[PDB]
Amino acid sequence: TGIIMENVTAFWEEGFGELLEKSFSHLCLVGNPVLKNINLNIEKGEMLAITGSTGSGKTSLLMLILGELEASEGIIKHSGRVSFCSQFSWIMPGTIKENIISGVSYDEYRYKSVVKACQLQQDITKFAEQDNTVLGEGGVTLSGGQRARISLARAVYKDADLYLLDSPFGYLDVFTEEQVFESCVCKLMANKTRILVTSKMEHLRKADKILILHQGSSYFYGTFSELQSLRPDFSSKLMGYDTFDQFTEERRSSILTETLRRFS
Ligand SMILES: Nc1ncnc2c1ncn2[C@@H]1O[C@H](COP(=O)(O)OP(=O)(O)OP(=O)(O)O)[C@@H](O)[C@H]1O
Ligand SMILES: [Mg+2]
């Protein structure tokens, strides 16, 4: 399914802040806009890369689609099931397999396809019981990347029309992340409409459409090509690094924020 948003604006509402964590009263009382004048038209099977300064409304735009935040003005169109992969990688009690499948029908081919694509084979091969290894609530002894890949495999394995992947790529095993983005987001999901919140420039370059947010506002919307010519200042600075995508998640967002605060 495709997804369209025409001149959308969403204001803070009670509770939304609580959900966001998983003050706010003032933002609600003041009728502050969490997202203002957002426009985007994503065709079926396309990939939308969302980035921007820290705390710019990336996760909120997602909640907007999940319907957890209402659109005070504007039109938002999209239909079908939507699968959501939150920034917080959760792990319920049970095996690695059980965690990837949860409440979905088991299809061996579908399953092994997703595990392989998410680069989980390199992990489970390390355990005596492989993907039948038992995890505890939170998968505490696993690495941040391992937890994200399983969390990501769960969202991906779910059959949906629209996938919302919030920042799955932000940990130290940066090389594995590059493989995962190529194999899973780019190949196995090539025909699935998908939105990826990211702070890696490669992802903007491979995307079909790009949305850069700053202060809940749309700093830029278009193709990676349109970005270089219509925002050379921003473009030049971020492309100016040799290996920006290998900096830590925090440095990338820091450079992104400062660049955004600078060029209006
Ligand atoms: N934990 C929090 N505590 C306080 N305010 C928050 C918190 N999380 C979000 N907010 C508020 O909500 C606004 C939008 O946050 P949102 O999570 O949508 O942004 P984001 O761009 O996804 O953030 P980030 O870059 O941290 O992941 C922020 O500008 C801030 O006012
Ligand atoms: Mg976020």
Swiss-Prot record:
Question: Where does lipidation (S-palmitoyl cysteine) occur on this chain?
Answer: C118
**Domain ABC transporter residue range list:** 23-240
Positions binding ATP 1 in this chain are W12, G52, S53, T54, G55, S56, G57, K58, T59, Q87
Tissues/organs with expression:
Expressed in the epididymis (at protein level). In the initial segment of the epididymis, detected on both the luminal and basolateral sides of the ducts where it is expressed in the duct columnar cells as well as in the interstitial smooth muscle cells. Expressed in sperm in the caput. In the cauda, detected along the luminal border but not continuously and is also expressed on the basolateral surface. Within the caudal lumen, detected on sperm. Isoform 1: Expressed in a variety of epithelial tissues including colon, kidney, lung, small intestine, pancreatic duct and testis.
Modified residue annotations for Phosphoserine: S143, S254, S264
Q: What happens when the gene is disrupted?
A: Mice are born at the expected Mendelian rate, but about 80% die within two to five days after birth due to peritonitis. Those that survive fail to thrive, appear runted and weigh about half as much as wild-type littermates. Many of the surviving pups die when they start ingesting solid food, due to intestinal blockage caused by excessive mucus accumulation. None survive for more than about 45 days after birth. Intestinal crypts in the jejunum and ileum are filled with excessive mucus. Excessive accumulation of mucus is also seen in colon.
Entry's localization field: Apical cell membrane; Early endosome membrane; Cell membrane; Recycling endosome membrane
So what does this one do? Epithelial ion channel that plays an important role in the regulation of epithelial ion and water transport and fluid homeostasis. Mediates the transport of chloride ions across the cell membrane. Possesses an intrinsic ATPase activity and utilizes ATP to gate its channel; the passive flow of anions through the channel is gated by cycles of ATP binding and hydrolysis by the ATP-binding domains. The ion channel is also permeable to HCO(3)(-); selectivity depends on the extracellular chloride concentration.
UniProt note: domains: Binds and hydrolyzes ATP via the two cytoplasmic ABC transporter nucleotide-binding domains. The two ATP-binding domains interact with each other, forming a head-to-tail dimer. Normal ATPase activity requires interaction between the two domains. The first ABC transporter nucleotide-binding domain has no ATPase activity by itself. The PDZ-binding motif mediates interactions with GOPC and with the SLC4A7, NHERF1/EBP50 complex.
Q: Please give the name of this protein.
A: Cystic fibrosis transmembrane conductance regulator
Organism for this UniProt entry: Mus musculus
Taxonomy, top ranks, is: Eukaryota, Metazoa, Chordata, Craniata, Vertebrata
